[PDB]
Ligand binder design. Structure first.
Ligand SMILES: *CCC(=O)N(c1ccc(C(C)(C)C)cc1)[C@@H](C(=O)NCC)c1cccnc1
Ligand SMILES: *CCC(=O)N(c1ccc(C(C)(C)C)cc1)[C@@H](C(=O)NCC)c1cccnc1
Lengths: 304, 304
């Protein structure tokens, strides 16, 4: 029993982190096979922050200008190319610690672990969610760029995020491993306001099922609702609309607990309307939305 | 910017996890050098739960009765001994992935990361604190025993916890790596009620400093207090008493922010007396106590 914000074991990803330096800028890179992936803003200087022309800046760079260090040993760069907002540095050596991997572009509401790194070295691991406004609420300092987000299925690492920047509001923006930003963000120091950060309704419901499985049941009520009635409440509280696809994904949790999805929606509706009255659920005083239905099942079943 | 419940990178510990089986009981073991450490309750059957005599049960076991598997390869057991509540299985092979390590017995209020494992395989990593009542609020299912807690200082892993059991209240109890339980708990299925789970005051203050560093400042007030006045409030709210040692450890955070420790205590006193009025601090609606002053400094400086 017990329910924690759990991250995947980070070992497989730690073995891929390298330090990339170009000129006087240093950030993290991801070494998989004979390619090092890193944010293309590694080529930017202090004056190439406001409006950089990456193609023009990249013409002034050769293979020897990219210094790639894995631990204390230097990697030989034999090629470089730009794909969207990432640089791919071909090196002459395949990473011997390369795990089985995939590149995935996640949907908003999905969760993943981040291995925060600085100068190619891992500092910590934590669990995140891609917000509906395509930002992530991370913990990243200067030099953390190139740190990656990932999920693991037995022995396969699915990389989904690469950190690029911090918006002026303290939230984080980045790309998939093809260099395409999540959301409308650009790798430029400009006014980029984030949109409405709505609550991930299907995740809050999954967490309420996790609470029931663990003994926190005070919020269960004698009521039920409909998808349309619940969604009128969700819109009022800036919660994402709940669809039949969401109800379907909550099916195993509904079956395990014996609580119909719509009955759980009615408990959520009452919690939104009345608040928690100073009470807690799974050690939290607010409704947690960074656990997907898959995460709840995984943690509650012990998937290794 | 941003502040997260961050765990240490778990790679160094993942390379030490093994599966230990004795009879029909399987749990996790920790392979360091040529020794595998695991809870001695691996020798217990369904009838040796109420009042096991570990010395008598261990006489019926030989080296070949302990099956130790590291991944898919079997380790040869050449010795076995009981030290307090842990078994030490001498194997014929030193773990090639053994990191630099130490065994430390932590104090209550200190934090550490847990690598939850099942059948020798890691499932997830999360950050914990040793509660003042010597329990940990973890996430552990059946078979998680032998999973370990640790801290890392550059390249040295300091193991501090080994999971042994779940109390009937859903909280967790375990030992240091010398097999000595934290708290009064015994490795027996009996009535073991936990004591008052008080709040770790020095940690809440460290987290309030982390909030200021990150821009969450609404709780800062125009008041100050004294250690004795603050402690009268702390006793009323089941917070641990704050000592001058605690004030001293908060010195770097006080210096960085320019907010005197006693001024921050006065903000905490007001938050305890008035509550949060529906507001949040670092994305939390309650006062977080599982970040030590060292953790705040580490995360806010990017220690790898
Ligand atoms: C890795 C670099 C870094 O820390 N940045 C950062 C600086 C500059 C840029 C460009 C050249 C694209 C404008 C991108 C990233 C930080 C940042 O986003 N600063 C504002 C632009 C940063 C700070 C903290 C966390 N992540 C990133
Ligand atoms: C690893 C074994 C396990 O899951 N236990 C457990 C069973 C039995 C014992 C003895 C023989 C000492 C009574 C210890 C541990 C679970 C447990 O504590 N059950 C009640 C005794 C368990 C369950 C969940 C998380 N951790 C441990």
């Amino acid at each position: 029993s017990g329910f924690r914000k759990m991250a995947f074991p980070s070992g497989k990803v730690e073995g891929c982190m390298v330090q990339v330096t170009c000129g006087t800028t240093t950030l993290n890179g991801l070494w998989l096979d004979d390619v090092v992936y890193c944010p293309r803003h590694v080529i930017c200087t202090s004056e190439d922050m406001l409006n950089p022309n990456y193609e023009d800046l990249l013409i002034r760079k050769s293979n020897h200008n990219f210094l790639v260090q894995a631990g204390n040993v230097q990697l030989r760069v034999i090629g470089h190319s730009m794909q969207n907002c990432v640089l791919k540095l071909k090196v002459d050596t395949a990473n011997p610690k390369t795990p089985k991997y995939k590149f995935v572009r996640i949907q908003p509401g999905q969760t993943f672990s981040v291995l925060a790194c600085y100068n190619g070295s891992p500092s910590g691991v934590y669990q995140c969610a891609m917000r509906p406004n395509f930002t992530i609420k991370g913990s990243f300092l200067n030099g953390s760029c190139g740190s990656v987000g990932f999920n693991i299925d037995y022995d396969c690492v699915s990389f989904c995020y690469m950190h690029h920047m911090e918006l002026p509001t303290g939230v984080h923006a980045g790309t998939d491993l093809e260099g395409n930003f999540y959301g409308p963000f650009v790798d430029r120091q400009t006014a980029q306001a984030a949109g409405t950060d709505t609550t991930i309704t299907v995740n809050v419901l999954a967490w309420l099922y996790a609470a029931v499985i663990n003994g926190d049941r005070w919020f269960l009520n004698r009521f039920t609702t409909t998808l349309n009635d619940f969604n009128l409440v969700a819109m009022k509280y800036n919660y994402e609309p709940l669809t039949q696809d969401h109800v379907d994904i909550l099916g195993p949790l509904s079956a395990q607990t014996g609580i119909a999805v719509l009955d759980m929606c009615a408990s959520l509706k009452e919690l939104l309307q009345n608040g928690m009255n100073g009470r807690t659920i799974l050690g939290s005083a607010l409704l947690e939305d960074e656990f997907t239905p898959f995460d709840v099942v995984r943690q509650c079943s012990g998937v290794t």
